[PDB]
């Protein structure tokens, strides 16, 4: 939608950095699902509680990292 009202250029716009970043956060979410679900069905309980651990870490890591991103992004382009 946004990229359609723009002329094709030769440089990377600050808008691209922000779209591409959010895109990654959601892509890594999917990856996380796969990782969690894959080591979850593994027979041993060794992997199973690791699976649980991955979620716990994600529930906090993702927000924290996205917040860190925002801070870096806005200081860099909001100037």
């Amino acid at each position: 939608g946004i990229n359609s009202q723009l002329p094709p250029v030769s440089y990377i716009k600050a808008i691209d950095v922000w779209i591409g970043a959010c895109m990654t956060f959601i892509f890594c979410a999917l990856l996380e699902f796969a990782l969690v679900n894959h080591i979850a069905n593994a027979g041993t309980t060794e992997w199973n509680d690791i699976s649980k651990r991955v979620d716990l870490i994600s529930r906090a890591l993702f927000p924290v990292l996205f917040f860190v991103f925002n801070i870096l992004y806005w200081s860099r382009f909001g100037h």
């Binding site: 094709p8 030769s10 440089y11 990856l31 679900n37």
Partner: protein
């Protein structure tokens, strides 16, 4: 070149195009510019997002074969999206 963002004027030439018509032979000049299409846009708006889309279709190879609803949802979504992007 600064008012021409989408392309890059790589080369120019100056030639003649004198032609013989039914009403006579008319002298003619021809200036030619060569336009090279900027790639950055198509990299970011076509190739990158398609690889990212194809790569997503792969993360379903790591879901247990029992949970096929997850696999289909991935493969089908990425496929549909691929269509839209092409359109």
């Amino acid at each position: 070149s600064s008012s021409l963002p989408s392309f890059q004027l790589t080369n120019t030439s100056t030639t003649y195009c004198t032609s013989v018509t039914n009403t006579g032979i008319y002298s003619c000049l021809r200036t030619t510019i060569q336009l090279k299409r900027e790639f950055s846009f198509y990299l970011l708006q076509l190739y990158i997002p398609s690889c990212m889309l194809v790569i997503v279709s792969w993360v379903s190879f790591w879901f247990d074969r029992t949970a096929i609803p997850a696999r289909v949802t991935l493969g089908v979504t990425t496929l549909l999206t691929m269509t839209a992007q092409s359109a």
